Amino acid sequence: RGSFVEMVDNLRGKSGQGYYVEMTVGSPPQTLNILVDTGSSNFAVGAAPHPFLHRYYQRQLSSTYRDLRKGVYVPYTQGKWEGELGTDLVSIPHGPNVTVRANIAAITESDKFFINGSNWEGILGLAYAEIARPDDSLEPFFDSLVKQTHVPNLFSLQLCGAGFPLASVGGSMIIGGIDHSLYTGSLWYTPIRREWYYEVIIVRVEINGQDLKMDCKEYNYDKSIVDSGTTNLRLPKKVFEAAVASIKAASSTEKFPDGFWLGEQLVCWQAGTTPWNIFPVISLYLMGEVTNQSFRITILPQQYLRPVEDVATSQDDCYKFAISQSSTGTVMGAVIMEGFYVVFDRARKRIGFAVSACHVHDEFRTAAVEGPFVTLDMEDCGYNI
Ligand SMILES: C[C@]1(c2cc(NC(=O)c3ccc(C#N)cn3)ccc2F)NC(=N)OCC1(F)F
Ligand code: NA
Ligand code: NA
């Protein structure tokens, strides 16, 4: 409890390519790097020689592979994978000293799934069975881990982002606990509304302290989730309109092309001259643990202006605006998570936020987690189908 030195710094990544953990599958163990995704619930790995892959799971080499004789086809908004289901022995070398029998989708065909130039070969879906494919009888990895071992039913993520001048990203996934060195201040908890995605309720939104003043249902239309497998802070379309209008207004000392705000083009500045000061902070108030109580998390432009390194077109420091409109609800992606240590307290159906000890900031502003606030009618903020 509180100290897990063996798991600290067990995540790696490259800007724009996500955060992965080393895992082993099979007997003898095959090592793979696996994207950590709190926005899905399948453990799925490359199992054939796709050209983007550094390596892939070779089931024929594992003495402990058990075939489920069942396939799954998994389409996403863009791209898809198809695989064959089975079980095998799985470990996380920089994790708990346990080995468990987990479901594994051996990916045999894919499209726009793997990233050319990335160093990961599969995905670890850490969300709940309700969103597992093909259905909720396919037990997620974390559920198997907790069922088969004494590992406590929680994990925490510290995602440490990037800045110019371009280093790899990193962080820590603490499995079965919390490491107090990874944050400062106190943890503040918000309820997991429903166990499917890591669904939460946003009750107020401010841009540099100025409330957008929308019906709070709009903030959670049709849901709000905490998602390590998405880069952007995605906002429902109506909310995005309001937020960007407000952010533009706050930054109006400099003018940027409309396309920049829509993620249609980059903006670049002479190296070391990024004008962070002109950009506002973004605050989300989350439903608290107690009736009529909330707390707020605040991120900086260092989180939502993402460095883009691979730009042959330009010699300068180029950035993408990583707040974007959504039709799937609010997605608190890496843009949010990189500000915080985030505790997925599954045992107590709650998500904790604390200021990350590694987050990117400057001399004038830091990311923040502050409470309590008085917020009435927070249960009305939830959207119902
Ligand atoms: C399953 C999936 C998914 C995510 C990824 N995710 C990434 O590539 C990725 C890239 C950068 C960062 C950062 N920072 C996080 N994730 C890749 C393939 C998927 F298939 N997970 C998800 N949370 O939303 C999109 C998705 F549903 F499509
Ligand atoms: Na257990
Ligand atoms: Na601390």
From Swiss-Prot:
N-Glycosylated. Addition of a bisecting N-acetylglucosamine by MGAT3 blocks lysosomal targeting, further degradation and is required for maintaining stability under stress conditions. Its main location: membrane. It is found in: Cell membrane; Golgi apparatus, trans-Golgi network; Endoplasmic reticulum; Endosome. GO terms for biological process: amyloid fibril formation; amyloid precursor protein catabolic process; amyloid-beta formation; amyloid-beta metabolic process; cellular response to amyloid-beta; cellular response to copper ion; cellular response to manganese ion; detection of mechanical stimulus involved in sensory perception of pain. It is a single-pass type I membrane protein. Its EC number is 3.4.23.46. Residues 19-354 form the Peptidase A1 domain. Glycans are attached at N97, N116, N292. The active site is at D37, D227. The keyword Protease applies. Expressed at high levels in the brain and pancreas. In the brain, expression is highest in the substantia nigra, locus coruleus and medulla oblongata. GO terms for molecular function: amyloid-beta binding; aspartic-type endopeptidase activity; beta-aspartyl-peptidase activity; endopeptidase activity; enzyme binding; peptidase activity; protein serine/threonine kinase binding. Inhibited by RTN3 and RTN4. Induction: Up-regulated by the Ca(2+)-regulated transcription factor NFATC4. Residues 1-385 are extracellular. GO terms for cellular component: axon; cell surface; dendrite; early endosome; endoplasmic reticulum lumen; endosome; endosome membrane; Golgi apparatus. The keyword Membrane applies. Disulfide bonds join C160-C358, C216-C381, C268-C318. Belongs to the peptidase A1 family. DXXLL motif is required for a proper endocytosis and retrograde transport to the trans-Golgi network, as well as for regulation of lysosomal degradation. This is Beta-secretase 1. It comes from Homo sapiens (Human). The lineage of its organism: Eukaryota, Metazoa, Chordata, Craniata, Vertebrata.
